[PDB]
Design a protein around this ligand. Structure first.
Ligand SMILES: Cc1ncc(Cn2nnc(CCOP(=O)(O)OP(=O)(O)O)c2C)c(N)n1
Ligand SMILES: Cc1ncc(Cn2nnc(CCOP(=O)(O)OP(=O)(O)O)c2C)c(N)n1
Ligand SMILES: Cc1ncc(Cn2nnc(CCOP(=O)(O)OP(=O)(O)O)c2C)c(N)n1
Ligand SMILES: [F-]
Ligand SMILES: [F-]
Ligand SMILES: [F-]
Ligand SMILES: [Mg+2]
Ligand SMILES: [Mg+2]
Ligand SMILES: [Mg+2]
Lengths: 565, 565, 565
C-alpha cells in the first residue's frame, strides 16, 4: 500500500514532477528513502539548502511546480529565503522539511539542530509568514489530508507551501491517493460577473479610441498568455510589456511596441502610454522598481485593472473572474481600437538603437557582449537574467517568438540565477539554456555549477566580470561595492576534478575581445557534455545607459525624508 | 458612489444579513455611521463585546452568516473568545474592528486602548490564530479586495474571519461592489473523484450487509442535511446522531434509532454500532467529549469517513468531493442494506425511558422540567441548550420534524447560550425560541436578556437553579463549584426598568413545583411583548443519569498520567 | 514535598499574595485543588473570566501583584483582554491557564474548548503579544524554572505574564522553592551612569531658573513616589500631575499646583508649564489622550525625561539608572529653583472653581454629586474612577494626603471599574473604598457586585445614571450611544437573593435630589455588611466642562486625513 513518504511521492508525480531536489540530514533520511521508491521521478542533490530552494524555483519556471526536501532547522531556515522568493515570484514550490521524532513533543527534550529549548513549533510558525499554506504532520493518519491540502493550495494560488514530517512516521502506512484530477480542481469564473466585467469594459472603451495594453508579470501565473494574444489581435491596439513581463507576449506580433518602464522605456513607448485614453493592465505588479522609483504610475482614471482572479473596471470591482476567461470572452466581443498603435507609428521614434559589430581585436565592451548573446537567441532558447546590469542587457534583446527570458525582479536575491539555471535546465533539457550573471552574484551560489557538471547539463554561462557590484555603484557608491576577484574560468576545472574521485566535462574560457568571445561561443555551442562558462572582462562603468537613469530614481525613492504624521 | 464603510455594508447585505451587531468605541464611530447608511439592514447594540460576538454566532445559526463590529484592542480581544467559538462551531462570522488613524503607524505614537508601545499589528497577528482569513485595511484603495477576500473565504470555509479598518478611512471613496453571485462562487466536485468515491463505497459495502450511518456535527456546515435523508432512505440502514448533531437528521424518519454517545447512547444504539459491518460517518468530529473520554472511537476497519470536502473509503482518500454531491450520487446508485436496522429492531431495547407526569404539588425535579419543556416542542421551535446538565436534558427530547436544537459542544463556553439565543431570536423571530440555561452559565452573560427586553423578543428562558456548577461537580468536586445565588426571577423587572427612563415587558416567574411550572409556562406562551424567565428550583444532585456516567469518563481522560517518551 | 501546583502556590505567597482569583473549568480543577492546599492565601471565585482578570488587576493596585486562574481557551481568551489591560497599566498580574493533558500533543487528537484542530500552541502564541513572559509547562521537571522565570520577570518589569499548565501534571512532584528574596533580586543602578545623569541635570538647569516638575503615570511602577517628594522639596519648584497620575503626588504639598492636561488643566497650570525653562518629567506616558489629541506635547528643548530605568538629559541617554535612585541623589545635590512656582503664584489664577452646596430639594446635578463624593474623601479613602465623565469628576477633587485615586487611562476598558473595585476591596479592606461608575460601563461587568455582596465588602458605589454613553456623545454622537435603562438600585436585592438559597446585605438606593443623595450617603457609610449602590439621576448633557473641550480634540485627532506618502 502507501506510506506517508510514498503518498507524498505519488502526489508529486501526479502534479507533473519528474524530479525533486534534496539535501540529506538525519531528520529526513528515511523520508528520502521513501521518495526514492517512486521510479517516475529522480532525486537531485544540491550543495546547500538555499541553492536547493532556488533550484526548485527554477524547475517550477520550466515545469509549473517543484519540490525541495531539507532537514529540520539548519536546512529549512536558509531554504526559507528561497521560499519567500517563490512566494514573491508566484511559483508553486513545495518545501518539505524533516522534523523531530514525534515522541519528543511535550517531553522536556532538547534536540540537535534546534534552539536548545524543548518546544518545536517555531519553524512552522515562521513558515506561515511566507507560504500560502503550512502544515506539520505528526501522525501518519493525518498525512493524506495535510499533503492534499498544501498541494491543492499551491497549484491554485500559484504560491509556495510548507510541510514538515516527523522523522519516525515517513515509512508508516496511510491511505492511498485518489485521482490526479482532484488536485487541479478549481472554481470556474462566476458567469454573471464575467459577462458584467466584459460589458463594463466595452462601455468603458466605447468612446476611448486610444487603447493600450500593458502586459504584467503575473500573466503566466494566471495562465493567460495565449488569451492575451487573442485579445490583442482582436483589439488591434498597442501592446507593451512591463520589465518583469519580458517574453510573456510575442515580440514578433505586429501590435507589440516594446518595453514600458518609465524613463527607461523603448523609444516612443513612454509617450504612447501617456497619450492613451485607456490602459488595460493584464496582471501587473506595480512596485518601487517597476514604477522606476514611483515616477511612472498608471493614471487611475484610465486604468482597467485585470488581475488573475478579478477585474476592476469603470469603478466596479468584479471578484471571481479568471483572467484567461475574461480575455477570451472580451476578444470575442471587442471591436477594433487602433488609436494608440496608430499614434505610436506616427511618432516615427524608430527601433531601439543597438551597437554595430565591434572590431574583433578591440577590448571587449558591454554592448558587444549583449550583441553576441542576442545573436544566439532562437525559438528554443531561454535566457536566465540575474539582478544587476544583466537585467538591463536582457531587456534590450529582441526575442524570436518562442524564446523565453526568466527574471526574478520582485524578490531580487542576487545569486538566484545560478541554482535557478540549474533547476530550469534539469526541467527543460531540450532547450538552449543561457545564464547571464554578474561576478558579484555568481559568488553567492557558485557551487551549484558543480551540479551542472555532475548532471552533464550544457548550460552556457556568460559571467560578466566587471570587478564588483555595478548596479549598487549606480544607486549609491561606497567601499562595500568592491569584492575579491576570482579566476572564474579556472573554477570549471576545479568542479570537473579530472584525475580525482570522479570527472567532468565542463569548460571555462576567458574573453577580453569580441574575437575571443566569438571563439568561446563556438566552443560553448559545441560542448554538449557539460556547462561552459565564458568569463567576459569589461569595466565597472561600462554599463547600460538604462541602469544609470533607473539607479538614480531608485536611490531617490529609498532616501526620501519622513513625512509629518 | 461607495465608501470603505458602505462597500462593507453592501457586501454584508449581499450575503443575506438583515442585521449586524455592534458596540460603539471612538475607533469605530465613523464606520458605524457608514454601515447605518444602508437601510437594508439594522444595527443592533450589545452590552459588551463578548456578548456581541456570541450574538453574531447565534444569528449565524439562524441565517447562515453574521457580522459584529467592535473597537480596537479593548473591544476586539474579548470578542476573540467568541470568534474562536465561531471557528470551533463552523460558522461564518465576520469580526470587524475599528483601528488607529492610518497616520499613527511608523510614527513613534503611543495610542489609547493599546499596550503603550508604538506598533499596532499585534491584534492582527493574534487574530490570525483563530480565523480562516484576517486582513488589515490601512488605505481606501485596498479595501474592496480585502473585504471581498475575507467574505468569500468565510462563506466557503464556513469559518470566521477578521477585518480591521483604520478609523480615518471609513468614509473615504473606493470602488463599487460587483454582483452578489461572485461571493458564493465555489469549486464543483471533481467528476472523476466523485464517481470513484461512490464506486469504492459500493465496493466496500458490497459484502457488508449491516450498514449504519452516523450523522456528525459538521453536516450543516456541509449543506448536506437534505442529501443525508435521500441517502438514508435509499440505503434503508440504521441512522444514529452524534450528540452535537442533534436535529441534523429528522427523528420521525423510520431509520432513525437515536443518539450514539458511547455508554450514554439511546437504548440499543451502542450495541448496534458495535455490530455494524460498516459505519458511514457523515461529517463527524471525534473529540474527547464526543467519544466519551476516548472510550467510544469508531473501528477504523469499518469506517467510511465522508467529510465536508473529501471522502476516505476502502483505504483511498478522495479530496475535492463535496459531501452533498457524494450523498446525492450515492443515493442514486446504492442498493438496500437493512442489516443494521433489522438488528436494532431485533434487540427489542424499547424507547428511551421517560418519567410520567409528576404530582403538581410535589417539589420540582429535573425530569419534570424536561417533560414540560419537551411538551412545548413544535415543528416551529428551536431549543438553545447550554453547556451543563442542559446538554443532557435536551439530548433526551424527542423532536418533531422541523424542530431544531442548537449546541455549542466543541467550544463549550458557558454563558454562550444567552447572547446566542438573543442573536438567534433576532434572526428567526418567526420561531418559538426556547433557552435552557443553568444558573452558573447565566451569570456570565446575563445582561444580554436586557437586549431581548429592548427588542421585544418573546424568548422563553428556563433558568435551572440548582445553586452551583453541577456538571463540574460530576467531573471533579471542590469549593470552586459553589456560587453566589441571585433572585433570577427578579432580574426581569430590573431589566424592564418600568418607571425609569424607558420600559420593558419582560416577565420573571418562580417555579418550585410541577404545578407552578405549568402555570409559568402558560404565562410565558402568552407573553408576546418580551422574554419570560422561569426560575426552576431543583437540587444539586438531581441531574440526568447520563451526566453522572459521562462525567466520570471525562475526569479519567483529563487526569491520565504522562506516558514514557 | 512540593507539586507543580503547590510550588506555584508557595511562590505566590512569597511575593505577598493573600488571595488569588479563579474560575473553575475541567482543565484547571486539579490545579485549583493544589492551590487550595496553601492556607496562607484564599481562593476567590468570579462570575466570568474577563471580570476575573480585572479583579486581579484591581488587587495588584492594592497589593503590588496578583494572580488569576482560568481554563484553556474559553477562559483564557477573554482574560487576555484584562491581561492586555495589566500590561498597559504596568501591573504584575500572573495569568495561569489550565491546559490539555500532556499526552494530547502530537497525537492527532481533537479536544474540547479548542478550535477543532489537533495542535495546541495557539493560546501561548497569542499570549506572547500581550505579556512580558509566557511559558507553557508540559512536564513537572520543567515547572520550577518556568514558574520562577515568569514571576521574577513580572515583578521586575511591572508587567503581566502568562503560564499554562498541563492538567495532568498539577499534582506531580517537583523541586521545592528557595528563599523569597531571589524573586525580588534586581540590578542596582550603574554608579557611573547615575552620577553622570545627576551631574548633567545640574548642568542643564544651572541657568534655567523656572523649573517645573511633571509627575507621570508610571511613577508608582518605578516605586518613586516618596523620592519624588524629597526631590520636589529640595528643588522648591512647581509640581503638576498628568491626568493619569492623580494621587501619585501629595496635593497638600506646597509645591503642588494641580493637574496639567492641556486646555483642561487646573487654573494657571497650562501657562506655567509653557513659561518653564525646564520641565522635569517623572515617568510620563504621552499618548493621544494625555496630550489632549496631540495639542499638548512638551517642548523637547526644555525636557528632562526621567523614565523608570533611564534618564535622557542634555542630549544624552543614560540607561541603567533607576528613577528612585536618580531622584534621591538629585535631591541631595540640587539647589533651590523657585522660578516656576513664583511665576505660578504671580498669576493669581486662583483655585479650581467649584459649585456651592445645592438646594437639597432641587433636581440632582453632576456638580452636586461630585461635591458630596469629594466631602467623603479621607486619608484612608480610595476612589476607583471609570472611563467616562467620572474621569473628569474625579480629576477635580482635592485629595487629603493619603487618599488615592485609581485610573485605567491607558487601556480604558469600560466596565474595568466594577471588578477592579472588587479586587481592590479584597486587597485593602481597611480602606474606605468608593467606586464612581457610569450606567454604560456598569452594564458590561455588573455581575461582579454580587461577589462584593458574597464577601461582605462595604464598597460604596455611585452609579451615575444619565441614560447612555455621555463621553462618546461628546466625541461623536449617534444612535449607538443610547442604551437600555435598568433599575440599577433594584439590582442589589437581586444579588442579595434574600429568601433564596443564601443571603446578602447589599443595599440599593435612588437619588434624584441633593437631599436624597445626602440621605443615601448616610445609609452607605453605616452599611458595614455589604456594598451600597446609589443610583444618581442626572441629564445626558449635564457633564463637566472639561469633558466637552477634551472630547472635541479627541474627535479631531481620530479623524485627521491621511498624509501624502
Ligand atoms: C541576497 C542579496 N544580498 C544583497 C543584495 C543587494 N544587491 N543587489 N545587487 C547587488 C550587486 C550585484 O552585482 P553583480 O552580480 O556583479 O552585477 P552588476 O551590477 O552587473 O555588476 C547587490 C549586492 C541582493 N539583491 N540580494
Ligand atoms: C467560559 C467558561 N468558563 C468555565 C467553564 C467550565 N464550566 N463548564 N461548565 C461549568 C458550570 C455550568 O454551570 P451551570 O450553568 O449552573 O450548569 P449545571 O451543570 O446544569 O449546574 C463550568 C464552570 C466553561 N465551560 N466555560
Ligand atoms: C470595552 C470597551 N468598549 C467600548 C468602549 C468605548 N467607550 N468608552 N466610553 C464609553 C461610554 C461610557 O459610558 P458611561 O459609563 O455611561 O460613562 P458617561 O460618559 O459618564 O456617560 C464607551 C462605549 C471602551 N472604552 N471600552
Ligand atoms: F539533519
Ligand atoms: F474606543
Ligand atoms: F474547562
Ligand atoms: Mg559585477
Ligand atoms: Mg447550575
Ligand atoms: Mg452614562
Amino acid at each position: 500500500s502507501y506510506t506517508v513518504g510514498t503518498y507524498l511521492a505519488e502526489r508529486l508525480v501526479q502534479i507533473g514532477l519528474k524530479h525533486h531536489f534534496a539535501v540529506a540530514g538525519d531528520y529526513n533520511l528515511v523520508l528520502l528513502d521513501n521518495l526514492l521508491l517512486n521510479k517516475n521521478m529522480e532525486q537531485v542533490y544540491c550543495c546547500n539548502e538555499l541553492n536547493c530552494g532556488f533550484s526548485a524555483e527554477g524547475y517550477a519556471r520550466a515545469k509549473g511546480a517543484a519540490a525541495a526536501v531539507v532537514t529540520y532547522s539548519v536546512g529549512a531556515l536558509s531554504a526559507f529565503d528561497a521560499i519567500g522568493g517563490a512566494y514573491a515570484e508566484n511559483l508553486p514550490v513545495i518545501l518539505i522539511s524533516g522534523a523531530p521524532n514525534n515522541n519528543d513533543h511535550a517531553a522536556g527534550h532538547v534536540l540537535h539542530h534546534a534552539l536548545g529549548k524543548t518546544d518545536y513549533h517555531y519553524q512552522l510558525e515562521m513558515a506561515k509568514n511566507i507560504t500560502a499554506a503550512a502544515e506539520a504532520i505528526y501522525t501518519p493518519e493525518e498525512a493524506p489530508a495535510k499533503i492534499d491540502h498544501v498541494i491543492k493550495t499551491a497549484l491554485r494560488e500559484k504560491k509556495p507551501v510548507y510541510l514538515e514530517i516527523a522523522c519516525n512516521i515517513a515509512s508508516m502506512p496511510c491511505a492511498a491517493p485518489g485521482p490526479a484530477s482532484a488536485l487541479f480542481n478549481d472554481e470556474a469564473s462566476d458567469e454573471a460577473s464575467l459577462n458584467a466585467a466584459v460589458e463594463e469594459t466595452l462601455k468603458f472603451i466605447a468612446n476611448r479610441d486610444k487603447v493600450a495594453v500593458l502586459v504584467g508579470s503575473k500573466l503566466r501565473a494566471a495562465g493567460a498568455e495565449e488569451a492575451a494574444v487573442k485579445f490583442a489581435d482582436a483589439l488591434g491596439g498597442a501592446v507593451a510589456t512591463m520589465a518583469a513581463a519580458k517574453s510573456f507576449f510575442p515580440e514578433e506580433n505586429p501590435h507589440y511596441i516594446g518595453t514600458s518602464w518609465g524613463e527607461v522605456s523603448y523609444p516612443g513607448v513612454e509617450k504612447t502610454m501617456k497619450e492613451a485614453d485607456a490602459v488595460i493592465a493584464l496582471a501587473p505588479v506595480f512596485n518601487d522598481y517597476s514604477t522606476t522609483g514611483w515616477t511612472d504610475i498608471p493614471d487611475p482614471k484610465k486604468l482597467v485593472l485585470a488581475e488573475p482572479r478579478s477585474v476592476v473596471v469603470n469603478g466596479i470591482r468584479f471578484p471571481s473572474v479568471h483572467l484567461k476567461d475574461y480575455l477570451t470572452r472580451l476578444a470575442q466581443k471587442v471591436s477594433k481600437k487602433t488609436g494608440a498603435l496608430d499614434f505610436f507609428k506616427s511618432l516615427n521614434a524608430g527601433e531601439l538603437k543597438k551597437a554595430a559589430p565591434a572590431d574583433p581585436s578591440a577590448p571587449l565592451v558591454n554592448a558587444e557582449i549583449a550583441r553576441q548573446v542576442e545573436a544566439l537567441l532562437t525559438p528554443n532558447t531561454t535566457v536566465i537574467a540575474e539582478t544587476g546590469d544583466s537585467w538591463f542587457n536582457a531587456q534590450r534583446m529582441k526575442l524570436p517568438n518562442g524564446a523565453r527570458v526568466e527574471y526574478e525582479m520582485q524578490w531580487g536575491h542576487i545569486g538566484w540565477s545560478v541554482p535557478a539555471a540549474f533547476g530550469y535546465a534539469v526541467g527543460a533539457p531540450e532547450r538552449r539554456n543561457i545564464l547571464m550573471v554578474g561576478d558579484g552574484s555568481f559568488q553567492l551560489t557558485a557551487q551549484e555549477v558543480a551540479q551542472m557538471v555532475r548532471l552533464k547539463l550544457p548550460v552556457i554561462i556568460f559571467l560578466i566580470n566587471n570587478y564588483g557590484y555595478t548596479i549598487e555603484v549606480m544607486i549609491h557608491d561606497g567601499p562595500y561595492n568592491n569584492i575579491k576577484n576570482w579566476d572564474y574560468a579556472g573554477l570549471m576545472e576545479v568542479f570537473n576534478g579530472n584525475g580525482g574521485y570522479d570527472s567532468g566535462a565542463g569548460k571555462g574560457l576567458k574573453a577580453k575581445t569580441g574575437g575571443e568571445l566569438a571563439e568561446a561561443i563556438k566552443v560553448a555551442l559545441a560542448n554538449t557534455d557539460g556547462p561552459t562558462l565564458i568569463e567576459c572582462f569589461i569595466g565597472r562603468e561600462d554599463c547600460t545607459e538604462e541602469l544609470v537613469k533607473w539607479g538614480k530614481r531608485v536611490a531617490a525613492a529609498n532616501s526620501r525624508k519622513p513625512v509629518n504624521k
